[PDB]
Design a protein around this ligand. Structure first.
Ligand SMILES: [K+]
Ligand SMILES: [K+]
Ligand SMILES: [K+]
Ligand SMILES: [K+]
Ligand SMILES: [K+]
Lengths: 83, 83, 83, 83
């Protein structure tokens, strides 16, 4: 799979995660984007997390949609700037 | 190994983690499921975590049983929807 | 590398992490073991973490010594029980 | 890619992360270094995290620059001391 295609998939994940957290959990756009990166990179500081049952379900789908996508994107990025 | 078989292994992990946290730690079903995903994806927000020695031991076994299973499942899912 | 050898390396990491956290940070044996697994699996709930400069340095060495070791062990375990 | 080159890339990431957190977030040098390792190893205890919009953006770039770099370095280190 082309790295740029994976990059586009990661951007879609970011939009989905950001907009979802902002609207379900009510956090600002900036915090929501930050939470999304922290979640799909599997850092998970826990300074922000879902507090509603819907937010919890949404976080689970984000985790499933976002973690593999993100990992492959960083590794393809690695290859690109180094090799 | 067939991806669907791995999927079944991940579902068993989810049941084990969810039921275990609910009964050992006393959290709701919804929170327990959310905690299980957050744990085996290695996100670990720490909004929920075990507070008993048994919960701690159980979390260690879940970690060992669940993390590799989950990682292989997301990567097989990746291959499937993209390739 | 033989999986059992990797298993032995992971056990040494666990002893090192557990004893180190217990003595540097002053937490119980049980909590220290739990913290060690949570750290080297990269879950990191943050219910426990080092509070001293030495604990912080020690956690960094544990991270470096433990994360790769643990990841290879779970993946070799995966191969073993499934294949 | 030579492991030592990757090691140098990881050292640059550590400097960037440490100095960035110290100056953007105002934490000590020691805490900033500890936070950097905890972040790029994807442990993320959340005992420390950015509290400003700039700190949040910076953490996102660190995550992107640091996570793949760190993972490849630990795995190359693994090969080296074991094989
Ligand atoms: K992680
Ligand atoms: K990880
Ligand atoms: K975490
Ligand atoms: K984590
Ligand atoms: K955390």
């Amino acid at each position: 799979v082309p790295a740029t295609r994976i990059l586009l998939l990661v951007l879609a994940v970011i939009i989905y995660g950001t907009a979802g957290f902002h609207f379900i959990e009510g956090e600002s756009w900036t915090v929501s984007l930050y939470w999304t990166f922290v979640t799909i990179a599997t850092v998970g500081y826990g300074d922000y997390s879902p507090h509603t049952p819907l937010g919890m379900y949404f976080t689970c789908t984000l985790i499933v949609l976002g973690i593999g996508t993100f990992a492959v994107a960083v590794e393809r990025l690695l290859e690109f700037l180094i090799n």
